[PDB]
């Protein structure tokens, strides 16, 4: 059949993979295998992805989920391509939309959400640290007041991680950040933080979240947030990657018909895996226990 460039809207639960792009397999391994098996691309294009002009918008890290990843590639446009690809994927990865595009077609503005147990906001001394903890309206206000401080453009140099010495200037722009009202599943309360920004740096969102957890739990005074903008280095706690979900990438390309499917997949596949892992493996709880190591 005809060779065309297409773009895919893809979603996946990230647990059990080492990221989108190449030691667990990666999401692209599952996608490349489905493409090969479905007959969309020849074996040598699976062996060397550069040969099908494969590109991904976001190089999601180990364990990170996505409701709205986008990739582009050249394929033979076989009949029922979407169903055929999906038939070779496990249930926790799905192609949600697929469009043919020009060949003039080739990412930095994104929305993420971060799903976490609400005891991440329980005060170390005044609240219980167990899962019976319930977020007060007052604590959620404090959380949202602190997260709103991130909006605008600031020097986020303390919110990344360098191999070598820290780069003293790392200005970045944040359009919005807030925490939604909590919800409960089998006695476990969670909430979703959403952030929209541009050109997120390695570990930036995880440390943005980690600092507000540290403040709200009582390890650091609120002053530390404005202070962290300054030239001095600050050791900002880095919350785990488990809860992080790529929700939307912004570049024309209109994924509006697919929003119902995006929501359904987040609800049925992405969030239950995060919840179940927090319940069974206590990732957040264990991470919070490390907060005393930070010198504030």
Short mmCIF file of C-alpha atoms in Angstrom, two decimals:
data_model
loop_
_atom_site.label_atom_id
_atom_site.label_comp_id
_atom_site.label_asym_id
_atom_site.label_seq_id
_atom_site.Cartn_x
_atom_site.Cartn_y
_atom_site.Cartn_z
CA UNK A 1 0.00 0.00 0.00
CA UNK A 2 0.85 3.77 -0.17
CA UNK A 3 3.75 5.14 1.93
CA UNK A 4 2.64 8.17 3.99
CA UNK A 5 3.82 10.17 6.97
CA UNK A 6 1.41 9.86 9.91
CA UNK A 7 1.22 11.18 13.46
CA UNK A 8 -0.10 9.07 16.35
CA UNK A 9 -1.61 10.13 19.68
CA UNK A 10 -0.46 7.48 22.06
CA UNK A 11 -1.07 6.77 25.75
CA UNK A 12 0.62 4.41 28.18
CA UNK A 13 1.07 3.47 31.79
CA UNK A 14 4.83 3.80 32.36
CA UNK A 15 5.37 1.21 35.07
CA UNK A 16 7.59 -1.65 33.90
CA UNK A 17 9.32 0.36 31.15
CA UNK A 18 12.56 2.33 31.01
CA UNK A 19 11.05 5.31 29.24
CA UNK A 20 9.66 6.19 25.86
CA UNK A 21 12.96 6.04 23.91
CA UNK A 22 15.91 3.68 24.32
CA UNK A 23 17.23 -2.13 31.61
CA UNK A 24 13.53 -2.74 30.96
CA UNK A 25 12.15 -2.41 27.45
CA UNK A 26 10.83 0.97 26.40
CA UNK A 27 7.45 2.04 25.15
CA UNK A 28 8.91 2.42 21.65
CA UNK A 29 9.97 -1.23 21.72
CA UNK A 30 6.33 -2.25 22.15
CA UNK A 31 5.28 0.21 19.45
CA UNK A 32 8.02 -0.88 17.00
CA UNK A 33 7.14 -4.54 17.53
CA UNK A 34 3.44 -3.79 16.89
CA UNK A 35 4.38 -1.84 13.75
CA UNK A 36 6.52 -4.68 12.46
CA UNK A 37 3.95 -7.33 13.34
CA UNK A 38 1.07 -5.31 11.84
CA UNK A 39 2.96 -4.96 8.54
CA UNK A 40 3.05 -1.04 8.69
CA UNK A 41 6.82 -0.96 8.38
CA UNK A 42 9.43 -3.43 7.10
CA UNK A 43 11.70 -5.27 9.56
CA UNK A 44 14.67 -3.12 8.70
CA UNK A 45 12.70 0.01 9.72
CA UNK A 46 12.10 -1.59 13.13
CA UNK A 47 15.80 -2.48 13.35
CA UNK A 48 16.82 1.10 12.50
CA UNK A 49 14.00 3.48 13.41
CA UNK A 50 15.77 6.37 11.73
CA UNK A 51 14.80 4.76 8.41
CA UNK A 52 11.03 5.37 8.92
CA UNK A 53 11.76 8.95 10.06
CA UNK A 54 10.51 8.10 13.54
CA UNK A 55 10.24 11.07 15.94
CA UNK A 56 8.68 11.40 19.40
CA UNK A 57 7.58 14.62 21.05
CA UNK A 58 8.51 13.77 24.63
CA UNK A 59 11.32 11.53 25.87
CA UNK A 60 9.47 10.41 28.99
CA UNK A 61 11.70 9.00 31.72
CA UNK A 62 11.54 5.64 33.45
CA UNK A 63 8.17 4.92 35.02
CA UNK A 64 6.54 8.12 33.67
CA UNK A 65 3.06 7.72 32.09
CA UNK A 66 1.45 9.59 29.21
CA UNK A 67 -2.14 10.29 28.27
CA UNK A 68 -1.14 12.33 25.22
CA UNK A 69 2.29 11.40 23.77
CA UNK A 70 2.60 12.16 20.04
CA UNK A 71 4.94 10.47 17.53
CA UNK A 72 5.41 10.74 13.78
CA UNK A 73 6.78 8.21 11.29
CA UNK A 74 6.42 6.97 7.74
CA UNK A 75 4.42 3.78 7.20
CA UNK A 76 2.60 1.79 4.56
CA UNK A 77 -0.96 2.96 5.23
CA UNK A 78 -2.54 -0.49 5.52
CA UNK A 79 -6.30 -0.88 5.96
CA UNK A 80 -7.61 -0.63 9.53
CA UNK A 81 -4.11 0.55 10.61
CA UNK A 82 -5.21 1.84 13.96
CA UNK A 83 -6.96 -1.42 15.01
CA UNK A 84 -4.11 -3.55 13.65
CA UNK A 85 -1.42 -1.70 15.59
CA UNK A 86 -3.43 -1.78 18.79
CA UNK A 87 -4.06 -5.50 18.36
CA UNK A 88 -0.34 -6.12 18.93
CA UNK A 89 -0.02 -3.88 22.01
CA UNK A 90 -0.69 -4.83 25.65
CA UNK A 91 -3.78 -3.16 27.13
CA UNK A 92 -1.75 -0.54 28.94
CA UNK A 93 -0.43 1.06 25.73
CA UNK A 94 -2.94 2.38 23.19
CA UNK A 95 -2.84 4.35 20.04
CA UNK A 96 -5.73 6.81 20.56
CA UNK A 97 -5.57 8.82 17.33
CA UNK A 98 -3.77 8.64 14.00
CA UNK A 99 -3.63 11.22 11.26
CA UNK A 100 -1.86 11.37 7.92
CA UNK A 101 0.16 14.57 7.57
CA UNK A 102 2.17 16.25 4.83
CA UNK A 103 5.84 15.29 5.02
CA UNK A 104 6.55 18.84 6.02
CA UNK A 105 5.55 17.53 9.41
CA UNK A 106 7.85 17.16 12.45
CA UNK A 107 6.91 19.92 21.34
CA UNK A 108 8.25 22.07 24.22
CA UNK A 109 4.92 23.42 25.61
CA UNK A 110 3.27 20.69 27.68
CA UNK A 111 0.78 19.91 30.36
CA UNK A 112 1.59 17.25 32.94
CA UNK A 113 -0.38 15.97 35.86
CA UNK A 114 1.05 14.36 38.99
CA UNK A 115 -1.15 11.95 40.98
CA UNK A 116 -0.12 11.52 44.60
CA UNK A 117 -1.41 10.22 47.93
CA UNK A 118 -2.63 13.19 49.96
CA UNK A 119 -0.54 12.28 53.02
CA UNK A 120 2.24 13.92 51.00
CA UNK A 121 0.62 17.09 52.43
CA UNK A 122 0.08 15.87 56.01
CA UNK A 123 2.05 18.01 58.50
CA UNK A 124 4.88 15.99 60.08
CA UNK A 125 3.69 16.79 63.62
CA UNK A 126 0.07 18.03 63.53
CA UNK A 127 -1.54 15.43 61.20
CA UNK A 128 -1.43 11.64 61.07
CA UNK A 129 1.07 10.23 58.56
CA UNK A 130 -1.15 7.22 57.74
CA UNK A 131 -3.58 6.75 54.83
CA UNK A 132 -6.51 7.80 57.04
CA UNK A 133 -5.14 11.29 56.66
CA UNK A 134 -7.62 13.53 54.89
CA UNK A 135 -6.67 16.78 53.14
CA UNK A 136 -8.27 19.81 54.82
CA UNK A 137 -9.59 22.67 52.76
CA UNK A 138 -7.00 24.80 54.60
CA UNK A 139 -4.11 22.57 53.60
CA UNK A 140 -5.28 22.45 49.99
CA UNK A 141 -5.31 26.28 50.05
CA UNK A 142 -1.72 26.31 51.26
CA UNK A 143 -0.78 23.87 48.54
CA UNK A 144 -2.42 25.96 45.84
CA UNK A 145 -1.01 29.23 47.15
CA UNK A 146 2.50 27.71 47.02
CA UNK A 147 2.02 26.16 43.58
CA UNK A 148 0.73 29.47 42.16
CA UNK A 149 4.05 31.04 43.20
CA UNK A 150 5.62 28.99 40.41
CA UNK A 151 3.57 30.73 37.74
CA UNK A 152 5.38 33.26 35.57
CA UNK A 153 9.05 33.21 34.57
CA UNK A 154 11.71 32.47 37.19
CA UNK A 155 15.28 31.22 37.51
CA UNK A 156 14.58 27.49 38.05
CA UNK A 157 18.25 26.56 38.32
CA UNK A 158 17.72 24.76 41.66
CA UNK A 159 14.94 22.69 40.12
CA UNK A 160 17.07 20.56 37.90
CA UNK A 161 19.94 18.09 38.21
CA UNK A 162 23.38 18.50 36.68
CA UNK A 163 26.02 15.86 36.11
CA UNK A 164 28.67 18.49 36.83
CA UNK A 165 28.36 21.87 38.62
CA UNK A 166 24.95 23.60 38.67
CA UNK A 167 24.25 26.15 35.92
CA UNK A 168 23.43 29.38 37.83
CA UNK A 169 20.83 30.65 35.26
CA UNK A 170 17.94 28.49 34.05
CA UNK A 171 14.97 30.77 33.35
CA UNK A 172 11.76 28.88 32.58
CA UNK A 173 8.07 29.79 32.09
CA UNK A 174 5.10 28.24 33.92
CA UNK A 175 1.61 29.07 32.73
CA UNK A 176 -0.41 27.37 35.47
CA UNK A 177 -0.02 25.01 38.39
CA UNK A 178 -2.58 23.85 40.93
CA UNK A 179 -3.91 20.86 42.84
CA UNK A 180 -7.43 19.48 42.23
CA UNK A 181 -9.84 18.51 45.02
CA UNK A 182 -8.94 15.05 46.44
CA UNK A 183 -10.72 11.76 45.81
CA UNK A 184 -10.79 8.43 47.68
CA UNK A 185 -10.43 4.85 46.43
CA UNK A 186 -10.85 2.17 49.09
CA UNK A 187 -9.87 4.48 51.93
CA UNK A 188 -6.86 5.86 50.09
CA UNK A 189 -7.10 9.55 49.25
CA UNK A 190 -5.35 11.01 46.22
CA UNK A 191 -5.19 14.32 44.43
CA UNK A 192 -4.03 15.46 41.01
CA UNK A 193 -1.59 18.35 40.53
CA UNK A 194 -1.57 19.83 37.05
CA UNK A 195 1.18 22.04 35.60
CA UNK A 196 1.41 23.72 32.20
CA UNK A 197 4.71 25.20 31.10
CA UNK A 198 7.41 25.29 28.45
CA UNK A 199 10.73 23.56 28.06
CA UNK A 200 10.64 21.60 31.35
CA UNK A 201 14.15 20.61 32.49
CA UNK A 202 15.32 17.23 33.79
CA UNK A 203 13.63 16.66 37.16
CA UNK A 204 12.04 20.15 37.11
CA UNK A 205 8.44 19.10 37.76
CA UNK A 206 9.41 16.44 40.27
CA UNK A 207 11.43 18.99 42.23
CA UNK A 208 8.73 21.66 41.92
CA UNK A 209 6.34 19.21 43.53
CA UNK A 210 8.99 17.94 46.00
CA UNK A 211 9.64 21.46 47.36
CA UNK A 212 5.99 22.19 48.03
CA UNK A 213 5.67 18.79 49.79
CA UNK A 214 8.65 19.67 51.94
CA UNK A 215 7.21 23.05 52.86
CA UNK A 216 3.67 21.86 53.48
CA UNK A 217 4.80 18.86 55.58
CA UNK A 218 6.87 21.19 57.77
CA UNK A 219 10.48 20.47 56.81
CA UNK A 220 11.06 23.85 55.20
CA UNK A 221 9.58 27.31 55.83
CA UNK A 222 7.66 28.85 52.92
CA UNK A 223 10.42 31.43 52.47
CA UNK A 224 12.46 28.69 50.83
CA UNK A 225 10.41 28.94 47.65
CA UNK A 226 11.37 32.55 46.86
CA UNK A 227 14.85 31.86 48.19
CA UNK A 228 15.26 28.97 45.76
CA UNK A 229 15.05 31.50 42.89
CA UNK A 230 18.21 33.15 44.16
CA UNK A 231 21.79 32.47 43.17
CA UNK A 232 22.54 30.26 46.19
CA UNK A 233 22.22 26.53 45.67
CA UNK A 234 19.35 24.81 47.45
CA UNK A 235 18.93 21.03 47.79
CA UNK A 236 15.35 20.69 46.47
CA UNK A 237 13.60 17.35 47.20
CA UNK A 238 12.78 15.40 44.04
CA UNK A 239 9.42 13.63 44.28
CA UNK A 240 9.21 10.20 42.58
CA UNK A 241 8.49 9.76 38.85
CA UNK A 242 5.66 7.24 39.45
CA UNK A 243 2.92 9.82 39.74
CA UNK A 244 3.94 11.87 36.73
CA UNK A 245 1.76 11.74 33.53
CA UNK A 246 2.38 13.61 30.30
CA UNK A 247 -1.12 14.94 29.49
CA UNK A 248 -0.80 17.18 26.45
CA UNK A 249 1.85 18.45 24.03
CA UNK A 250 1.31 21.77 22.22
CA UNK A 251 2.78 22.71 18.84
CA UNK A 252 -1.48 22.60 13.19
CA UNK A 253 -2.78 19.43 14.87
CA UNK A 254 -6.23 19.04 16.51
CA UNK A 255 -6.86 16.07 18.80
CA UNK A 256 -10.35 17.18 19.91
CA UNK A 257 -12.41 14.16 18.76
CA UNK A 258 -10.08 11.98 20.84
CA UNK A 259 -10.51 13.72 24.20
CA UNK A 260 -13.13 11.25 25.43
CA UNK A 261 -10.72 8.39 24.70
CA UNK A 262 -7.84 10.22 26.37
CA UNK A 263 -9.92 10.66 29.52
CA UNK A 264 -11.17 7.06 29.51
CA UNK A 265 -7.62 5.69 29.20
CA UNK A 266 -6.25 7.85 31.99
CA UNK A 267 -9.12 6.68 34.20
CA UNK A 268 -9.03 3.02 33.29
CA UNK A 269 -5.31 2.35 32.74
CA UNK A 270 -3.05 5.16 33.93
CA UNK A 271 -4.47 6.15 37.30
CA UNK A 272 -5.33 2.65 38.60
CA UNK A 273 -1.72 1.52 38.10
CA UNK A 274 -0.35 4.48 40.07
CA UNK A 275 -2.95 3.99 42.80
CA UNK A 276 -2.33 0.24 42.98
CA UNK A 277 1.43 0.73 43.13
CA UNK A 278 1.10 3.31 45.97
CA UNK A 279 -1.17 0.88 47.81
CA UNK A 280 0.91 -2.25 47.37
CA UNK A 281 4.44 -0.83 47.20
CA UNK A 282 4.17 2.42 49.23
CA UNK A 283 6.46 4.39 46.94
CA UNK A 284 5.31 7.81 48.20
CA UNK A 285 5.37 6.77 51.83
CA UNK A 286 8.95 5.51 51.49
CA UNK A 287 10.10 8.63 49.65
CA UNK A 288 8.60 10.95 52.27
CA UNK A 289 10.61 9.13 54.93
CA UNK A 290 13.76 10.50 53.25
CA UNK A 291 12.83 14.17 53.63
CA UNK A 292 14.85 14.63 56.84
CA UNK A 293 18.07 14.28 54.75
CA UNK A 294 17.61 17.73 53.15
CA UNK A 295 19.38 20.62 54.86
CA UNK A 296 16.94 23.55 54.89
#
